[PDB]
Design a protein around this ligand. Structure first.
Ligand SMILES: *[C@@H]1O[C@H](CO)[C@@H](O[C@H]2O[C@H](CO)[C@@H](O[C@@H]3O[C@H](CO[C@H]4O[C@H](CO)[C@@H](O)[C@H](O)[C@@H]4O)[C@@H](O)[C@H](O[C@H]4O[C@H](CO)[C@@H](O)[C@H](O)[C@@H]4O)[C@@H]3O)[C@H](O)[C@H]2NC(C)=O)[C@H](O)[C@H]1NC(C)=O
Ligand SMILES: *[C@@H]1O[C@H](CO)[C@@H](O[C@@H]2O[C@H](CO)[C@@H](O)[C@H](O)[C@H]2NC(C)=O)[C@H](O)[C@H]1NC(C)=O
Ligand SMILES: *[C@@H]1O[C@H](CO)[C@@H](O[C@@H]2O[C@H](CO)[C@@H](O)[C@H](O)[C@H]2NC(C)=O)[C@H](O)[C@H]1NC(C)=O
Ligand SMILES: CO[C@H]1O[C@H](CO)[C@@H](O)[C@H](O)[C@@H]1O[C@H]1OC[C@@H](O)[C@H](O)[C@@H]1O
Ligand code: CA
Length: 475
């Protein structure tokens, strides 16, 4: 059963790789409907670099070698577009480092190209040296949007919470591997202002903080709290940094615990029509916004990871409740794939979605699905933490619906409406995380145990970055 399902995920990954190689490589991505190419990530070949960790884990040597040869020719000092410090760090930097850790460790006998493997660290070092000026600010909090040729930026006065707090794993791993502590120092200095938030009005509940930080002095600029896009991964990385090295980052763990408890006490929310469902709300100056995003569903997985690592059953229980809410948004639509955004405010239910809200527990705000991985990700952690078969089955059901609804002759496409036959209309877009995250979590849910799988308690020897790239844990 499981070997056949695993082989089926490898087939769908191969399908998209063949199309990408055929019509777009070395550009950043395949345009799956017109069978063409696009470059949304600076032209360095994002889909190829994001696919490396997944191909190694699946044991596809031919795909691995092709990517290793490509990395060697990249020139990270040149590009015709502005550069995102956040996106460049989580996809390219983490993708090369993960490949290096996997090929230097658990998969050391998959290929013979030691010089090309060694070059994965060389190019990671090269990439950070081109990006580091972003941190050379008064406070140390970086400008996320920069011009790597001029060294200029977009003129912003504040940097977002997630884009500021989702860098420490990759940049610190680079120092540990190289020996040059500069990378860890820069990223940890930026993180410092988030662990000891000021002014206190910016931290409404213990551990839950505002959404923007002033670049000149490190003080927060607002008091809006949420686990949605723009905020999410800051909380994700607090507990993950503890798994990376519990000695060095015990402080990060303490701050996550406060965030987890405050979230269970204040942001938890049950729809009036379906009290047995749980979603997280957002908060701003005493008012609760009753809506969420597909992005937010990484939440169940975080509570499950922190819960098993800290032997806290109440965190494991809450993570499963969030996992059930997200599975409800998926299994309530016609395609069996969930919406990008939704709501449950009893006072704002759309007249045309009345019957639906009443039975499902929510009304849809945006019905598109852009090949996102967060729901399958949290189902994957639920399976690894509890060992229960139902969560594996939910990963399989979601994978089959994506393969039936989104597949084209060359790859997979984003769709406009998950509650209409065939997804409504396909968008000419295939993001690189299709390769890095959707295909990897779907395969791991069905594949053999190994050091790269997520583990229980204090047994993890690898920790996943926010783009599903596993990093070897410290020392
Ligand atoms: C479409 O999505 C649905 C929504 O996610 C999904 O529904 C179910 O999903 C879960 C299936 O496992 C289910 O969760 C379980 O519920 C068990 C029963 O709980 C009920 O009764 C107790 C009474 O004491 C109440 O406390 C609960 O609130 C609830 O009313 C529960 O026993 C179980 O917990 C055990 O197992 C977990 C590990 O799985 C352990 O950690 C725990 O200690 C227990 O041993 C778990 O909570 C969920 O309740 C249910 N959702 C709803 C609202 O219906 C559908 O399955 C899905 N449909 C399809 C086609 O896939
Ligand atoms: C990044 O900044 C560089 C400046 O160093 C911009 O390139 C210059 O653009 C001007 C305006 O068209 C040209 O006249 C110069 O010849 C360019 N200089 C060089 C050496 O290329 C570039 O446009 C900026 N990039 C982005 C994405 O805005
Ligand atoms: C994912 O989609 C592919 C393409 O539709 C499925 O493969 C096809 O399956 C049919 C049987 O229904 C065969 O007749 C075709 O020859 C297959 N085509 C190819 C290119 O292999 C595949 O079965 C789907 N995967 C899962 C797990 O459902
Ligand atoms: C635009 O959304 C992405 O970037 C935001 C920051 O501007 C993040 O807060 C948000 O989580 C999101 O990042 C995920 O996007 C999909 C994949 O690249 C990864 O899973 C990112 O975590
Ligand atoms: Ca993520």
């Amino acid at each position: 059963s499981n070997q056949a399902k695993a082989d089926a995920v490898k087939e769908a990954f191969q399908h998209a790789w063949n199309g990408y190689m055929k019509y777009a490589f070395p550009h950043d991505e395949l345009t799956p409907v017109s069978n063409g190419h696009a470059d949304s990530r600076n032209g360095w070949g994002a889909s190829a670099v994001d696919a490396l960790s997944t191909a190694v884990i699946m044991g596809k040597a031919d795909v691995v070698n092709a990517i290793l040869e490509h990395v060697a020719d990249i020139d990270f000092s040149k590009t015709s577009d502005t550069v995102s410090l956040f996106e460049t760090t989580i996809r390219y930097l983490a993708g090369m480092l993960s490949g290096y850790d996997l090929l230097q460790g658990p998969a050391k006998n998959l290929v013979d190209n030691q010089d090309l493997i060694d070059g994965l660290l060389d190019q990671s070092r090269n990439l950070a040296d081109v990006l580091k000026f972003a941190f050379d600010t008064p406070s140390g909090v970086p400008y996320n949007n920069i011009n790597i040729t001029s060294h200029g930026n977009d003129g912003a006065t504040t940097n977002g919470l997630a884009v500021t707090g989702t860098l420490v794993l990759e940049w610190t791993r680079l120092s540990d591997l190289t020996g040059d502590e500069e990378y860890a120092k820069l990223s940890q200095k930026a993180e410092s202002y988030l662990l000891k938030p000021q002014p206190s009005s910016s931290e409404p509940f213990p551990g839950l903080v505002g959404s923007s930080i002033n670049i000149n002095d490190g003080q927060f600029a607002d008091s809006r709290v949420s686990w949605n896009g723009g905020d999410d991964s800051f909380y994700e990385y607090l507990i993950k940094m503890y798994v990376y090295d519990p000695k060095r980052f015990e402080t990060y763990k303490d701050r996550w615990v406060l965030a987890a408890e405050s979230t269970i006490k204040h942001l938890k929310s049950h729809p009036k029509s379906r009290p047995d469902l749980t979603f997280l709300s957002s908060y701003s100056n005493r008012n609760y916004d009753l809506s969420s995003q597909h992005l937010t569903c990484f939440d169940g997985g975080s509570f499950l990871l922190g819960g098993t690592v800290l032997d806290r059953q109440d965190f494991i229980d809450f993570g499963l409740e969030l996992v059930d809410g997200c599975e409800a948004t998926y299994n309530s639509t016609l395609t069996k794939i969930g919406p990008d955004s939704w709501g449950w405010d009893p006072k704002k239910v759309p007249s045309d979605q009345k019957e639906f809200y009443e039975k499902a527990g929510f009304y849809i705000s945006s019905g598109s699905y852009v090949l996102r991985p967060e729901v399958i990700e949290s189902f994957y952690y639920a399976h690894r933490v509890t060992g229960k078969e139902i969560y594996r089955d939910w990963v399989w059901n979601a994978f089959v619906a994506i393969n039936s609804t989104c597949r084209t002759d060359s790859g997979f496409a984003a769709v406009s409406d998950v509650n209409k036959a065939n997804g409504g209309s396909k968008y000419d877009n295939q993001e690189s995380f299709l390769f890095a995250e959707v295909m990897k979590y779907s395969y791991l849910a069905h594949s053999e145990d190994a050091a790269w799988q997520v583990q229980k308690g204090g047994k993890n020897t690898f920790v996943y970055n926010t783009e599903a790239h596993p990093i070897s844990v410290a020392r």
